Design a binder for this molecule. Structure first.
Ligand SMILES: C[C@@H]1C[C@H](C)C[C@H](C)[C@@H](O)CC(=O)O[C@H]([C@@H]2CCC[C@H]2C(=O)O)C/C=C/C=C(\C#N)[C@H](O)[C@@H](C)C1
Ligand SMILES: C[C@@H]1C[C@H](C)C[C@H](C)[C@@H](O)CC(=O)O[C@H]([C@@H]2CCC[C@H]2C(=O)O)C/C=C/C=C(\C#N)[C@H](O)[C@@H](C)C1
Ligand SMILES: [Zn+2]
Ligand SMILES: [Zn+2]
Lengths: 401, 401
């Protein structure tokens, strides 16, 4: 269960010294990534998030305003144009605030949930870089919630439900949660922190989640909730976070018109479920030992011919399944059937369909799996039905599992 | 007819001086972008392209070997880590070759068509920066085809068909193709050039396209054809290109095992249809003067009510249309109905569904368009079917005509 070895065996990705900590996504790994993107977007539509795109770099003055220049300085890449210095974005938050600042905002626009798949580049020490898990470039599932003080609790709640939904989808039911509270010195009033902390704690309690306090471990800009999933090996992976920010909105001059027609500064919530999506792909790759659920599988079905006599037929089927929204390849190569079966078994292809003369005559397909289960001769439309159902339900288990 | 004014009016995007030439995509504009992306991906599936993702930056040595350091130096952003120089990629081609170089290749792996939506950063003089059309950051619809000299003609044919298909989708049927031939000094033998040029010419006239010749205007690394579409104002936009490259594979050491069991260097084809996708979004914004075909429209349907009495009903409908894959908003505020219709008409929302008491009792909707047409009372499911068809087909035209 090493995501790098499995990564090479399935031709998911590769890395080079000319770009340390930056992934080359091959077709299949990128298919996995894009499927993750699809799932996340379904969740964004369900939980009602906007999806935006921020610029890759912004000038140094912005990053000084946000405080990244004081705190994040070593971790940022800098480039320059026309005697102006720019940092490549380590985070998507300031850009999101810049978007929020366009147009007048009122209380009616709140809560405003703004999501992006962030392309972030942090310059990490090269000695710390490991696989997909510790990288210089990465893509965050990143959202920011602009709300009022009264809307905090509910929004945190929605974030919690989102976390558990999304995690249970991949089969992680074991989640340890940590609430980090105020340090000795902080931005924001004692009252603001009391409200925020009470909101987090109470939300977690109402969702029936046992959690542990980490005292003084909260950032100076706000209290937070962190989510650690456990894999099938009982290894701990910290992914999800809900973080309050009392710093960013005032520094970037975010404001809205309240009910009283008075200028208010919105509360900000950083929320991420998977965190780094590259890293999450590493984690999934190791959890699944290379066998991905059908919806996550780069190639879902491979259709093979015994001889050239089946070729036409195979092609025919390959179109049909392709038009059904299934990811399917045909192996027409001149090879023995066992060669193909072996090759596609090592590739962890969920479904191998075999066409001999029997299938050409009958209008059926011989169905077998990567687990060595023979499902036997099946009607094509039946196969398409079951595959489509398995894909739409994002099931962890195959037919007859 | 200014994509900047229309962009501001429709809340599509904005730009700042902290990121010159770099777009902040708001929710709506990003929705347009995502629809473009989806369409292109449909064409990638149809024309059988891989989709990959390359790294954002790479070592300066790489860009020296590609020839960018000599030719592209002023256009590239440079950043550094641990006493090593990296360039942010102006182009996606070297990364694609790097991916290609992973694993042994044979002729049986060819043609290999590799696509990406490239995030490319070139450093353009700030004074030449205009809107979405001239930008520092951009996303290219980019592909590279690795093939044998024998497959060149077929691949160019495929690219041509792709170009005309995609352009036809957006309503540009007026296209001028220009074939740029060999410069006095060039990379590659006169034979390679005779064959490539003849392949471009013959593919073009196989497609019945009266191409114009540009003599000696080709690059030193290969011959090309370029595609210029004309809009409704009959102004020319050069977008697509098919560009042969003899320089890149040799410089980057790409090779495959021939059918003769000998070492072969793959022929490389750079191909793009839209070119910059931001720029193409601008061009489309001006072409449609803000009225995006329903498939491209950020908000496809706005369901509105007369009084509170219809609110519930409206909500139902909204959810329904949201469940049918339609992008739909509910306008519940207390305002004149005409107020709402005018506001959403100026927002270029394709369809406005008006619900009064009669619609509630009859289970229907009163259908209106941004063009000012009254489509009358309609069955809800009928509207859903027609909208779904209009979207699936990517029709340039709305209902009732
Ligand atoms: C410039 C400051 C850097 C900060 C002190 C770095 C710490 C190590 C830590 O606080 C980072 C953090 O938890 O950010 C977390 C993010 C969320 C997902 C994972 C983590 C992530 O992206 O790593 C969210 C907070 C962002 C905070 C800001 C912004 N923007 C603040 O306004 C600003 C004061 C941050
Ligand atoms: C480093 C060299 C720069 C070249 C001299 C710049 C010229 C102005 C022009 O030839 C660029 C060009 O046509 O690139 C075109 C692209 C395609 C879409 C529009 C254009 C685009 O991206 O702008 C593709 C060519 C890429 C070529 C290489 C690469 N990699 C070559 O191996 C290498 C020798 C190019
Ligand atoms: Zn953030
Ligand atoms: Zn290229």
């Amino acid at each position: 269960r090493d995501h790098r070895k499995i990564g090479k065996q399935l031709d998911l990705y590769h890395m080079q010294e000319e770009a340390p900590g930056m992934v080359f996504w091959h077709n299949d790994g990128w298919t996995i990534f894009r499927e993750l993107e699809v799932f996340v977007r379904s969740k964004l539509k369900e939980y009602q998030y906007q999806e935006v795109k921020g610029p890759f770099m912004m000038d140094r003055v912005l990053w000084e305003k946000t405080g990244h220049w004081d705190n994040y300085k070593d971790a940022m890449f800098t480039t320059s144009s026309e005697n102006r210095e720019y940092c490549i974005k380590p985070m998507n938050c300031p850009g999101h605030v810049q978007i929020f600042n366009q147009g007048l905002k009122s209380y009616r626009d709140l809560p405003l949930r703004m999501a992006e798949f962030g392309s972030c580049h942090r310059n990490e020490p090269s000695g710390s870089l490991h696989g997909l898990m510790r990288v210089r470039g990465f893509t965050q599932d990143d959202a920011h919630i602009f709300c009022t003080e009264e809307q905090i609790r509910d929004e945190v709640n929605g974030c919690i439900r989102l976390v558990y939904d999304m995690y249970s989808t991949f089969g992680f039911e074991k989640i340890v949660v940590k609430l980090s509270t105020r340090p000795e010195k902080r931005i924001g009033s004692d009252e603001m922190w009391d409200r925020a902390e009470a909101d987090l704690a109470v939300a977690l309690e109402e969702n029936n989640i046992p959690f542990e306090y980490q005292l003084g471990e909260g950032a100076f800009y706000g209290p937070k909730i962190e989510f650690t999933l456990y894999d099938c090996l009982d290894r701990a992976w910290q992914c999800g976070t809900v973080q309050l920010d009392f710093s960013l909105p005032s520094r970037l001059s975010a404001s809205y018109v309240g009910e009283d027609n008075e200028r208010k500064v919105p509360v900000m919530i950083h929320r991420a479920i998977l965190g780094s999506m590259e890293r999450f792909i590493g984690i999934l790759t190791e959890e699944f030992a290379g066998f991905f659920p059908t919806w996550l599988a780069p190639v879902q079905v491979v259709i093979m011919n015994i001889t050239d006599s089946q070729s036409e037929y195979v092609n025919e089927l390959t179109q049909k399944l392709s038009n059904a929204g299934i990811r399917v390849k045909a192996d027409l190569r001149n090879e023995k059937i066992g060669f193909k079966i072996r090759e596609h078994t090592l590739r962890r292809v969920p479904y191998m369909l075999v066409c001999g003369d029997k299938e050409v005559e009958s209008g059926k397909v011989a169905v077998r799996t990567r687990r060595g289960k023979d499902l036997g001769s099946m009607d094509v439309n039946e196969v398409i039905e079951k595959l489509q159902q398995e894909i739409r339900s994002r099931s962890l288990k195959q037919l007859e599992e």
